C-alpha cells in the first residue's frame, strides 16, 4: 500500500517551496492512532484502582506494597474458594473467578514492571556515570605517572 501520494508534486527538486515542499509531518498531535498513551485499570477492570507512590527520599510506607499484598491475598483466597466450589459442585463454576484472578495478577505484574523499570534505569545510568568518572580519573592518573616516568628517563641522561 503506497501511501505516499502526490510525491512528485510536493517533493520536487526543480524549485522547492518555502519550507514545506516535501515536509512529511508526523502525527505528533490531532491523531489518536496510538491511542493517547495506553490502557489503564479503570476501563477494562471496572473496580477500585488500588495505586500509590511516594516521592524522593521517602519510602511508600506500606501504601503500594501493602495494597498489592492485600490484593494478592484476596485473589488467592477467592481462587481457593472457587477451587473448593468447583471440586464440590460441578466443574463450570470457578471459571469466572479464575479469569478475574488471572486478570488481577496480570495487572499487578504490569504495574510492578512499570514501577521497577524507571528506578532500575536511573540506577543503571548513575552507575554508568560513576564508572565513566572513575575510568577517566584512573586514565588521568596513569597519564600523569607516565609523564613523570618520562621526565625521569629524560633527566636521567
Amino acid at each position: 500500500p503506497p501511501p505516499p501520494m502526490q510525491y512528485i508534486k510536493e517533493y520536487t527538486d526543480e524549485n522547492i517551496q518555502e519550507g514545506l515542499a516535501p515536509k512529511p509531518p508526523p502525527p505528533i498531535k490531532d491523531s489518536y492512532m496510538m491511542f493517547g498513551n495506553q490502557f489503564q485499570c479503570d476501563d477494562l477492570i471496572i473496580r477500585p484502582l488500588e495505586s500509590q507512590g511516594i516521592e524522593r527520599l521517602h519510602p511508600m510506607q506500606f501504601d503500594h506494597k501493602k495494597e498489592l499484598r492485600k490484593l494478592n491475598m484476596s485473589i488467592l483466597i477467592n481462587f481457593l474458594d472457587l477451587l473448593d466450589i468447583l471440586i464440590r459442585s460441578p466443574g463450570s463454576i470457578k471459571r469466572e473467578e479464575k479469569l478475574e484472578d488471572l486478570k488481577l495478577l496480570f495487572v499487578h505484574v504490569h504495574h510492578l514492571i512499570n514501577e521497577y523499570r524507571p528506578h532500575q534505569a536511573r540506577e543503571t545510568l548513575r552507575v554508568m556515570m560513576e564508572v565513566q568518572k572513575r575510568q577517566r580519573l584512573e586514565t588521568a592518573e596513569r597519564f600523569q605517572k607516565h609523564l613523570e616516568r618520562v621526565i625521569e628517563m629524560i633527566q636521567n641522561c
Binding site: 511516594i54 506494597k65 491475598m73 488467592l76 477451587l83 471440586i87 464440590r88 505484574v109 568518572k133
Partner: protein
C-alpha cells in the same frame, strides 16, 4: 530487576491455582497437599517480591529527581574528565613537539 521475576511469580501462582482447581476433583490428599505448598510458596514469594521491589518512580517525581541528580553528577564528572583530558593532551603535544625537535637535529 525483580519486575519480570514478580511477573513470572504471579503467572506461576495463577497457573498453580488453576491446576489445583482442575485436579481437586492417599493420591488425592497428597496432590492437594502438594498444590497447597506450591500455591502458598508462590503467593509468599510474590508478596515478598512486591514488598522488597524498587519503591520509587511508580509516580513521576522521585524518578525525575533522581535522574536530575544523576545528570548533575554526570555533568560535574564530565567537566572534571574534560579538564584532565585537556591536561593529558597538552602533555602529549609537548612530548610530540620535543620528539619532533629531537628528530629534526
Amino acid at each position: 530487576d525483580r519486575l519480570t521475576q514478580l511477573q513470572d511469580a504471579v503467572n506461576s501462582l495463577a497457573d498453580q491455582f488453576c491446576n489445583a482447581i482442575g485436579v481437586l476433583q492417599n493420591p488425592t490428599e497428597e496432590y492437594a497437599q502438594l498444590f497447597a505448598a506450591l500455591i502458598a510458596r508462590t503467593a509468599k514469594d510474590i508478596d515478598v517480591l512486591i514488598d522488597s521491589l524498587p519503591s520509587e518512580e511508580s509516580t513521576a517525581a522521585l524518578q525525575a529527581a533522581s535522574l536530575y541528580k544523576l545528570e548533575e553528577e554526570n555533568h560535574e564528572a564530565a567537566t572534571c574528565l574534560e579538564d584532565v583530558v585537556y591536561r593529558g593532551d597538552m602533555l602529549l603535544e609537548k612530548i610530540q613537539s620535543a620528539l619532533a625537535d629531537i628528530a629534526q637535529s
